[PDB]
């Protein structure tokens, strides 16, 4: 089969076509990054407006790219949440009505299930069961995954998620929003150990996370130290290493608790080159395996929605004529 | 020709069908329900009309202004249908729609349309029907504070009819304007009143491909303050 997948949950418009035989037939993406960069965050109304300008043309360009016509599409999938109500509504109305007009089933997709499954799009997808690390802008969870929709929350952040933590310390360092990818690059020219940040919630057992203490620890360090590019880079690396090591330690503990030998890494922060190497090294020493998506599928993208749409269609999750979005949509609520 | 019209720019949901002059129309109030009602209603009106989506020659949609969220529901649902069924699209102003409704209901030909835009402001338009049934005044559409509407009405003369939630929120909008103001008995736009406008636009070749359909928000200063620098 073939599933058209539509992603507009936040600040990026994504359209893909997934073929369960041939693979990925189309991938289209428009990022609104420079729309919101002057505001220091995503302005909801400006996001909602640009999705209206991009959704349809990107859909046209995906069918055009793929050389496919409407009859070649067996289902239409769209992100129903979580995300900005305003953004999610663009993708879901176009999607629901496009499926109505094509007379094919419509498939509402959970955005985080999307990230979680994106690694299934590479060579050698992980088999169930696995531990999953979901590290994004607003979410940082450890999950025990035994199958589709069998997602048990092992751990989560009680305050800032890792991504926002990267974005907030990146801003203190004077970088564009979102600065997480830019702090990481800045940190590449940092001296290891020059500064030493805490690894939060690693002195007691447990699998929950806390990162808000790192912003303060970074801010305080930038304030008592030089402004030369090198010292800035030294703080950036101190911050990265701290986050990466915190996530690593937590992943270890979750693999220990569950007994699983497979670690799935997901969300925007999973693009982080330092965290990829580190997780990959740890699973070697454990005689197990790490899985993550190509960097482009870590951040928001339509391809993961065309895939998870495919998966949920096979699992019976079609929608009636109603359209509904869920800006807050707990992963725990997805049925099996 | 056949025309399908849908609208969700305000608290109402409506769909209407025109079949070479014979009209099928449905209207109801949908506060907080638009996405749960809109596609079921398109389906109702197709089936009860014995017409399929592929029979339709043009899709008309309420283009704005109104609720940003409602305006996008309308355009998004319409784009999907048109994309999906390969239909050309016709964007109809919600202010002009309510003016047509006034014309329909009591023969009004001079309409002051005001929508509650919230934030102390109203979406404003002065529409006037010519002998041939065409509405003039599309250039007058704006989002305005009550005091600037007052200044606008001072440049106007005569008798006008009033339509839209605007006057419902500001009943003394035209106080000391110098005009004779009559209630136009139209609170909200109805897809049925899109049809005749849609028809004339269709005749003169004013239909666009799905990718050209655009909302009209009027209020464009929607963002918080830029960062220092
Ligand atoms: N190379 C990188 N290093 C660190 N962080 C990164 C990197 N690349 C992306 N990110 C982070 O990824 C986030 C965006 O990814 P994603 O879309 O998963 O999160 P989100 O949409 O904010 O989260 P949620 O889905 O919980 O709302 C940003 O916080 C960004 O800083
Ligand atoms: Fe995301």
Numbering used by the authors:
A (entry chain A): 1 to 336
B (entry chain C): 1 to 229
What's the paper's own text on this?
The N6-threonylcarbamoyladenosine (t6A) modification at position 37 of ANN-decoding tRNAs is one of the few modifications that are found in the three domains of life. In the first half of the reaction, YrdC utilizes ATP, L-threonine and bicarbonate to synthesize an unstable intermediate TCA, whose threonylcarbamoyl-moiety is subsequently transferred onto the adenosine at position 37 of the substrate tRNAs by the cooperative action of three proteins YeaZ, YgjD and YjeE. In archaea and yeast, the transfer reaction requires the kinase, putative endopeptidase and other proteins of small size (KEOPS) protein complex, composed of Kae1, Bud32, Cgi121 and Pcc1, complemented by a fifth fungi-specific protein Gon7 in yeast. It is now well established that YgjD and its orthologs Kae1 and Qri7 are responsible for the catalysis of the transfer reaction. YgjD and YeaZ are forming a heterodimer that is capable of interacting with YjeE.
We wanted to analyze the importance of the Mg2+ ion, by mutating its Glu12 carboxylate ligand into alanine. The crystal structure of YgjDE12A–YeaZ in complex with ATP determined at 2.3 Å confirmed the absence Mg2+ in the active site. Interestingly, this mutant has ATP bound at the active site compared to ADP for the wild YgjD–YeaZ type although no binding of AMPCPP to YgjDE12A was observed by ITC. YgjD probably has a very weak ATPase activity, which is inhibited in the YgjDE12A mutant, explaining why we observed ATP at the active site of the mutant. Moreover, there was no electron density observed for ADP at the YgjDE12A–YeaZ interface, suggesting this site could have a preference for ADP rather than ATP. We observed that the in vitro t6A activity of YgjDE12A is totally abolished. However the ATPase activity of the ternary complex YgjDE12A–YeaZ–YjeE is not affected by this mutation. These data further confirm that YgjD is responsible for the t6A coupling reaction and YgjE for ATP hydrolysis.
